Ligand binder design. Structure first.
Ligand SMILES: [Mg+2]
Ligand SMILES: [Mg+2]
Lengths: 108, 49, 49, 143, 40, 54, 58, 49, 133, 49, 142, 239, 157
RNA sequence: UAUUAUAUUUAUUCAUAUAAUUAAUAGGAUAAUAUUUGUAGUUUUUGAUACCAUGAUAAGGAUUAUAAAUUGAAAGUGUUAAUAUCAUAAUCAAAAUUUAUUAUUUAUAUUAAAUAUGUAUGUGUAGAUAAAAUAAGAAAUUA
């Protein structure tokens, strides 16, 4: 069948047991997001920092289709900022002498 | 597959050169012209077709 | 594990190593891949007869 | 009463039994209730708190090869300062447990809009206008 | 010419400056220790 | 005809077909007989003695 | 022509859901015939704006 | 087109439509290369020309 | 008990072939064995069907000028047709005839392939405009 | 008869209506257009003779 | 739509009072087509140039049996008056006839001679509610 | 007007209605050809044996090998009953079909002792022979299963050679009209919609279609039907 | 017909097909129509060769020919109905109820985007977009830039 | 009680729909030869319709706040997938106001291309209503 393609190759994980630690469970009046992680948002911005995703040159991220979130165009691999620039590049920069605009008008 | 068949696809280029060079294509052995005609019908087609 | 992607690729990429599988299969075994007629609750809808 | 009728889905090569009883209900007074949660291998071990009973050679191999968990937890929390990870409140929570072992008119409707760690990220069926957590609408110029 | 160029398969034309696949990308994701000095 | 052996009805048509089969099995005669060309029913061939129903 | 051939043929192994165009700019000899397009004096009678109405082209 | 309009009854009219969308042929020459001695010894394009 | 659209119909193909050909079973489309197509319409019915389906221009429409009814009813009001001899008294007749409907071969490419300015599109292939023949 | 002549459709049901499973394969981008290059037995024979 | 005055009552939504781009409203309803102007008489709702030919619709184009009404963009010509032949136009409820011929019509399109929205109202095409609403606006007496 | 034959019914008389286009496994629509005029074992009902068939040897080859024998080509007579065999195919040898499975498992010596002639090596050409070409075929399958490289069956064999009309087995082309209900072994539940549906086993089987198909002569075919024409029980549009 | 054995759930989808044929008729009649218009309305002389009484005569001859062409498709495009190829929902083009590059109505665009069928990208509902050109001058500017790369970058010959 | 302000500004004459037939495939120059030029087997079915005939996305501010950061929400607004058993109602122009749900041009100069609105000057004047703390500029009466 054409549909023979859409079978499950592997046995899917069963639901054996209870809701996870600090699950959203709603009592008499509760405003509940299934979406927001209960434990990792409660954790202070001072400590964890404003980052939603790893701090990496953004070329590695893609704005997802159908999901409000970004993903990495190489699954899960990450290259640090240091790998975008030349070795020991001041403020990782193609060349250390000037900022982008400085480079433009020097060139002109 | 058998890769080296791609070579036959050179042929319609060579034939074109033979016309630029003034080598008449009808002096080619009957034999070779059979093999070439085959090679053609594999890779050559016109804008019409 | 779960499948992130799916591709149709020839079976000779991964096939059980010749020393693991029975000797010449084409010649000594008649194999047909066919579909169960009965309703299969779970498991595969095809089997090798 | 014009009572609505729903016809049962039977197990299918892509739609196994548990998926059906968990994602599909034939009684339509139970529609549009809310999300249910379940646990898998590790999150189940955390929630259920199954004490491991001692066992054969592997279990004593792993009683002797254990090392300091007081420390390992600490390390793993720290490691969130690595370039490729974030710092997690969960990792911290695990450390803590091991140490202590002995606008304002709209923020009903802005509930997704800060920098939000997600669990399940929202999807376009469920969220009309949200852009995602990484997004900056009013960017400043930075060198 | 040839459909697959000599440079690919002929060891006379071997390029000594090419490196294997695994090495560069392992070397790349390296984050060296940020506290190289006292004070900073 | 190349892929399947045969012409296939559209999905919609198939739905109405299957439904007729299901509901012809319990009740009869909530029905009507509507054709494109009526002569085939009004003068049927020389044979054709429809099986009586109850 | 061989390079051109490889190049036109990259369209068969392109990545998934990706397409391409081919721009060519080459050099070619043109030939100006002073025989077919001779350079002569302007006619003894000139041509007016009246030979240029709409449909004058036709 | 290699994608969608590659292979069926619409491949023809889509192809032709691209070809007609692409009819433009740009013809260039530098005025530099027009200033050369003509076969008659007179410069082919001089200042006034 | 029986509701038809058309009362009668006819066979596409003629006696010599059919009388013998019937002893060989032909496979009809499994989900709709009986086929009554526009080749099978009678002459009258074909005429009627062919008039309709062309918006305003087409002869079916009462006001196209090709209408054969002598009377037509707009909201309970009965309107009697103005004959063309009478229409012409104030509305001059400029009629070239059928040659006006066909451009030369020379223009076929300007016109995206057609010689014919009629209201329906005209195909030059055998099959699209095929009736039985 | 021919054992590669094989059902491409499922048994007709409401599962074709109530589900987003696709009714045909998506086109395969890298499969070439099928075209005719090849000769008959008769033709080969004619050439040899 | 609320009331179906035609078939389209079933297919179309009103969408409240909705704005369309300039001079494209889906349905061409020319309420203004008879809108008196002495000084603009020859330029208003008529041909932009007086050297234009009369439209298609003043001519018999093909072999006709006859027509019921002539189109409303047909222009009234001295022969319309003089010949004494039926000149009909499709207006609502049914048809408007030019019965009483005048030269003052000549050279204008029948769009312009036929008042689209009459000051006359049928009380019998109106619901009791609609009649109420027409009394509020001070149209119908009551 | 309408009735159980003409209307849409999932089930007619408590069994799945074969008349519905949607009551069949779609695979039944896939195109097939008529077999019946071909050699018995090529036909589709014997499909389990198809991998085994034998390369043919025609009458021409047979006469040629009568006049011009090859040393290591063996012509082996498979005729089973001695009561029916009155002549000797030249240069042949006798291994009756019934013994083959045993015979081919003897050592060279033992085989020599039981059949009185040398056992063909597995390289040599072995041509098999029978009355109709049926037993020779089955024997062929035996010889092929021990792996003999050249095994040819001569169909039409002893009948064509000697002009005898005999048969190895009595099997007739006509199938007995199907007796019971439709076998539950052919009923095919669907995997997606869990819907029970017919297959072409049983009372519905292609054999029955080919068997009752129109004869290939106009006169004999017109004899089969009443004066007015071939199918008059049906409404015009089903004819 | 007469709602017997209809294949599609919405009957009106057929109208969409009718529409296609309208555009086809226009391709067949546009050049012709416009030439007859231009030659008809021309007040200046046509040319050096055709002037005066000949020109007047030829003008009338042409518009007479153009009026004689029965079924010639003269209807302006903005007066043709836009109707969905999917659900046969209609919308006025140039309005927020019609979506131009997919040529579907708002209703279908919504349905198709939310259950993923179209591949688009969501952008903040309130601005101009990701696009530079739209960001500069809005709809009119982008409209212009499209004109510029279709036409003006060519110096025609 | 600390983690900090509603009493400011600007608005309110709001209308627009029409002239019935949805049911199938069929390839052409530069190809080793098909008139397959011109491929001809009426008639047993019935729902999306003008009509009962389940599903699904709107709008609707009321307390997770400032830092490297969005002032728009799930509780569902015509068109979408299992209940059928009155009927062809669909734009391809030029057309007939009763509909809660709409920011119009207000006094030097005023109808040229698709045909394009003739009406209400009345002391910025009842009742009743609308909108905004966001590259703008407003500051003191919580549960
Ligand atoms: Mg709803
Ligand atoms: Mg219609």
């Amino acid at each position: 069948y054409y549909w023979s393609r859409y079978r499950m190759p592997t046995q899917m994980p069963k639901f054996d047991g209870p809701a996870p630690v600090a699950a959203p469970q709603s009592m008499n009046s509760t405003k509940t997001n299934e979406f927001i992680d209960p434990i990792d948002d409660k954790f202070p911005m001072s400590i964890r920092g404003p980052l939603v995703r790893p701090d990496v040159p953004e070329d590695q991220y893609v704005d997802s289709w159908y999901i409000c979130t970004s993903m990495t165009h190489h699954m899960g691999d990450y290259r640090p900022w240091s790998a975008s620039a030349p070795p020991n590049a001041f403020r990782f920069r193609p060349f250390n002498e000037f900022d982008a605009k400085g480079r433009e008008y020097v060139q002109y | 597959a058998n890769i080296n068949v791609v070579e036959k696809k050179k042929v319609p280029l060579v034939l074109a050169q033979m016309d630029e060079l003034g080598v008449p294509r009808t002096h080619l052995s009957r034999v070779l012209m059979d093999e070439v005609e085959d090679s053609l019908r594999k890779f050559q087609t016109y804008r019409s077709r | 594990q779960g499948a992130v992607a799916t591709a149709e690729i020839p079976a000779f990429f991964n096939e059980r190593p010749a020393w693991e599988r029975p000797p010449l299969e084409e010649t000594l075994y008649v194999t047909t891949n066919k579909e169960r007629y009965d309703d299969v609750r779970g498991g595969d809808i095809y089997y090798d007869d | 009463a014009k009572r609505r009728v729903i016809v049962p889905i039977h197990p299918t090569p892509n739609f196994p039994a548990h998926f059906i009883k968990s994602a599909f209900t034939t009684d339509p007074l139970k529609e549009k209730q809310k999300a249910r949660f379940s646990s898998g291998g590790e999150a189940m071990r955390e929630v259920q708190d199954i004490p491991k009973n001692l066992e054969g050679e592997r279990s004593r191999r792993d009683l002797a090869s254990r090392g300091d968990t007081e420390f390992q937890a600490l390390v793993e929390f720290i490691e969130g300062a690595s370039y490729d990870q974030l710092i997690s409140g969960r990792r911290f929570k695990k450390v803590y447990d091991v140490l202590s072992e002995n606008g304002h008119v709209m923020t009903p409707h802005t509930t997704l809009h800060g920098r939000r760690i997600f669990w399940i990220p929202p999807t376009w069926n469920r969220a009309g206008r949200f852009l995602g957590p990484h997004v900056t609408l009013y960017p400043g110029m930075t060198p | 010419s040839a459909n697959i160029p000599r440079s690919v398969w002929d060891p006379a034309q071997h390029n000594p400056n090419w490196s294997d696949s695994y090495g560069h990308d392992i070397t790349n994701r390296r984050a060296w220790p940020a506290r190289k000095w006292t004070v900073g | 005809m190349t892929v399947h052996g045969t012409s296939l009805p559209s999905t919609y048509r198939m739905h109405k077909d299957i439904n007729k089969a299901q509901r012809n099995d319990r009740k009869l005669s909530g029905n009507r007989f509507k054709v494109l060309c009526s002569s085939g029913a009004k003068n049927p061939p020389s044979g054709w003695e429809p099986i009586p129903d109850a | 022509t061989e390079f051109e051939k490889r190049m036109y043929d990259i369209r068969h192994w392109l990545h998934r859901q990706t397409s391409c165009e081919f721009h060519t700019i080459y050099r070619r000899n043109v030939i100006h015939d002073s025989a077919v397009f001779p350079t002569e004096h302007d006619p003894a009678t000139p041509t007016t704006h009246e030979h240029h109405r709409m449909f004058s082209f036709a | 087109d290699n994608l969608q309009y590659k292979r069926y009854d619409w491949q023809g009219w889509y192809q032709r439509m691209l070809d007609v969308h692409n009819r433009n042929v740009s013809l260039r020459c530098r005025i530099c290369d027009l200033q050369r001695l003509d076969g008659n010894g007179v410069q082919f394009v001089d200042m006034q020309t | 008990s029986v509701s038809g659209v058309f009362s009668k119909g006819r066979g596409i193909g003629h006696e010599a072939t059919t009388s013998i050909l019937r002893y060989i079973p032909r496979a009809r489309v499994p989900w709709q064995p009986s086929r009554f197509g526009r080749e099978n319409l009678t002459a009258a019915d074909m005429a009627r069907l062919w008039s309709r389906g062309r918006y305003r221009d087409g002869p079916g429409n009462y006001n196209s000028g090709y209408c054969t009814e002598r009377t037509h009813v707009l909201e309970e009001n009965t309107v009697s047709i103005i004959p063309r001899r009478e229409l012409e008294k104030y509305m001059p007749d400029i009629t070239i005839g059928p040659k006006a409907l066909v451009t030369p071969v020379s223009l076929m490419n300007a016109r995206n392939g057609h010689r014919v300015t009629h209201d329906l599109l005209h195909s030059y292939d055998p099959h699209i405009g095929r009736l039985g023949k | 008869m021919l054992s590669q002549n094989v059902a491409k459709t499922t048994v007709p049901s409401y599962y074709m209506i109530r589900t987003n499973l696709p009714h045909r394969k998506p086109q395969n981008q890298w499969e070439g257009v099928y075209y005719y290059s090849g000769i008959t037995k008769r033709q080969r024979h004619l050439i040899l003779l | 739509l609320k009331i179906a005055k035609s078939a389209f009552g079933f297919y179309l939504a009103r969408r409240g009072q909705r704005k369309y781009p300039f001079l494209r409203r889906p349905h061409i309803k020319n309420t203004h087509s008879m809108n008196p102007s002495a000084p603009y008489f020859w330029s208003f709702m008529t041909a932009k140039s007086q050297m234009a030919f009369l439209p298609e619709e003043n001519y018999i184009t093909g072999d006709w049996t006859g027509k019921f009404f002539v189109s409303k963009r047909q222009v009234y010509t001295l022969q319309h008056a003089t010949s004494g032949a039926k000149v009909r136009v499709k207006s609502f409820p049914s048809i408007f006839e030019f019965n009483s011929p005048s030269r003052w019509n000549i050279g204008k399109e029948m769009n312009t001679l036929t008042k689209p929205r009459m000051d006359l109202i049928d009380e019998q095409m109106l619901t009791k509610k609609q009649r109420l609403d027409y009394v509020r606006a001070g149209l119908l007496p009551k | 007007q309408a009735d159980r034959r003409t209307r849409h019914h999932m089930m007619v008389d408590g069994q799945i209605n074969p008349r519905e286009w949607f009551n069949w496994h779609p695979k039944e629509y896939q195109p097939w050809y008529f077999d019946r005029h071909k050699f018995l074992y090529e036909q589709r009902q014997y499909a389990q044996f198809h991998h085994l068939l034998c390369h043919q040897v025609y009458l021409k080859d047979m006469l040629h090998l009568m006049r011009y024998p090859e040393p290591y080509t063996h012509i082996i007579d498979c005729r089973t009953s001695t009561q029916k065999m009155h002549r000797w195919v030249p240069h042949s040898l006798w291994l009756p079909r019934d013994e083959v499975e045993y015979a081919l498992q003897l050592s060279a010596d033992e085989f020599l002792d039981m059949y009185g002639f040398r056992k063909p090596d597995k390289s040599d050409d072995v041509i098999l022979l029978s009355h109709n070409g049926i037993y020779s075929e089955q024997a062929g399958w035996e010889w092929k299963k021990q792996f003999f490289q050249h095994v040819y069956n001569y169909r039409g064999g002893t009948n064509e050679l000697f002009g005898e009309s005999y048969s190895d087995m009595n099997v007739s082309d006509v199938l007995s009209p199907w007796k019971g209900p439709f076998p539950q072994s052919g009923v095919f539940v669907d995997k997606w919609s869990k819907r029970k549906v017919l297959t072409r086993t049983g009372p519905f089987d292609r054999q029955y279609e080919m068997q009752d198909f129109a004869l290939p002569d106009l006169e004999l075919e017109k004899a089969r039907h009443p004066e007015e024409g071939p199918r008059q029980n049906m409404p015009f549009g089903l004819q | 017909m007469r709602h017997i054995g209809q294949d599609v759930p919405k009957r009106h989808t057929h109208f969409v097909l009718e529409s296609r044929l309208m555009y086809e008729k226009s391709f067949r009649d546009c050049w012709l129509h416009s030439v007859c218009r231009a030659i008809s309305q021309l007040d200046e002389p046509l040319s050096k060769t055709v002037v005066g009484t000949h020109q007047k005569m030829l003008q009338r001859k042409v518009t007479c020919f153009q009026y004689n062409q029965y079924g010639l498709f003269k209807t302006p495009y903005y007066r043709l109905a836009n109707v969905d190829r999917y659900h046969a929902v209609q919308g006025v083009a140039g309005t927020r109820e019609w979506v131009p590059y997919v040529n579907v109505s708002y209703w279908t665009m919504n349905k198709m985007v939310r259950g993923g069928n179209l591949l688009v990208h969501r952008v903040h509902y309130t601005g101009w977009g990701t696009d530079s050109h739209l960001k500069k001058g809005g709809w009119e500017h982008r409209w212009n830039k499209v004109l510029q790369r279709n036409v003006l970058q060519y110096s025609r010959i």
